[PDB]
Design a protein around this ligand. Structure first.
Ligand code: COA
Ligand code: COA
Lengths: 180, 179
């Protein structure tokens, strides 16, 4: 299958994206699902799709949050039935090329830990904040490790973001060579 | 000088807010300044202002970003001629109370360093990241210290956010006692 820029004018494709988002995150994409999809189609954003034949199996987007330099990776979803076969890796790498081409320097993201997937949850993060970040361990195949393998680093945490001891984990990667 | 809920239907107050935002952050607030002000009026957000008889002297807002438990403090501004008189402190204190009333647990913010205002800028933040964060110093009266004095702690940094060696500094505070 191929990874390419998402055709913002393809009703069918946009429908599959909506479903994929609703299925994956039913609590986050219930009503305004097709609506948030349109939000992801914004010209200022980047929208990359993974299509097998004619089926959308993965999608990744990026939002410019700091001028043209800092972008937020959001969202990233791969059909639960097509995971573990480099689709996510290929989507992230394609996104990075697209961001760089627009003058982007860094991409960051927030990956939450709501069900004790890592050692950063179920603990007071204001205590030994960064020692805990540095010694993080993946307890339940939390996706933060997916990003680490792609070169992203945990650069921060948001204590009790989603409720007591259910933090958001901030990760980032600078995608181009540093002026030398 | 009464710090209270911002009147979201007052067009004149909104124009002053728009003005204050363009004077404080001319790079972030330009032609579409009125639009950005309307976004701050969204029903889910908290909007609080310090008003002296008729002049808008300060404004603070908050956005629920994680359910209703995690809120981003944005924006916060006090007229230059009125600073260092506790108006900022009072705006934040008032906001924290209102956020808590709405179910908030944590308030966070991102304060950028674009002009070597702290030791975190003008250096490759990917080398000894947390060592540098741990020994941060305030070089040009950067506002991160204002938040630190109010109980906020640096919980993260985004290297090269605004361009090489011009990071964003993430700070946060849990506003209610831990059960
Ligand atoms: C996380 C996700 C996007 C990864 O997509 P994918 O196509 O399955 O990932 P890939 O096959 O490209 O994985 C590449 C590498 O990352 C690792 N990896 C992937 N998901 C992982 C996880 N949850 N925990 C640990 N490692 C993981 C793989 O083992 C592989 O490592 P290896 O090369 O050493 O074997 C996908 O599983 C998904 O859709 N998850 C749910 C959505 C989500 O929570 N996203 C996080 C955004 S906040
Ligand atoms: C940052 C700002 C809101 C502070 O408002 P303020 O009314 O001047 O703050 P206060 O007078 O309540 O300050 C309380 C304490 O913080 C300190 N403080 C305030 N601004 C500070 C700064 N920039 N650097 C260091 N300390 C600062 C005060 O000295 C005082 O300390 P003390 O209690 O030890 O005497 C104001 O300067 C402002 O509007 N700045 C421009 C916009 C901005 O940068 N906003 C921050 C968003 S990231």
């Amino acid at each position: 299958m191929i990874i390419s820029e998402f055709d913002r004018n393809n009703p069918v494709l946009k429908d599959q994206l909506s479903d994929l988002l609703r299925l994956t995150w039913p609590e986050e994409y219930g009503d305004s699902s097709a609506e948030e999809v349109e939000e992801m189609m914004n010209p200022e954003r980047i929208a990359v799709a993974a299509v097998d034949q004619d089926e959308l199996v993965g999608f990744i987007g990026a939002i410019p949050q700091y001028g043209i330099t800092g972008w937020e990776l959001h969202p990233l979803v791969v059909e639960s039935s097509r995971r573990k076969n480099q689709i996510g890796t290929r989507l992230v790498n394609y996104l990075e090329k697209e961001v760089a081409s627009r003058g982007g320097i860094t991409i960051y993201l927030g990956t939450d830990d709501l069900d004790h997937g890592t050692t950063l949850s179920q603990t007071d993060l204001y205590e030994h904040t960064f020692d805990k970040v540095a010694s993080i361990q993946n307890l339940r195949e939390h996706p933060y490790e997916f990003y680490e393998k792609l070169g992203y680093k945990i650069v921060g945490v948001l204590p009790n973001a989603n409720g007591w001891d259910k933090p958001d984990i901030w990760m980032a990667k600078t995608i181009i060579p540093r002026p030398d």
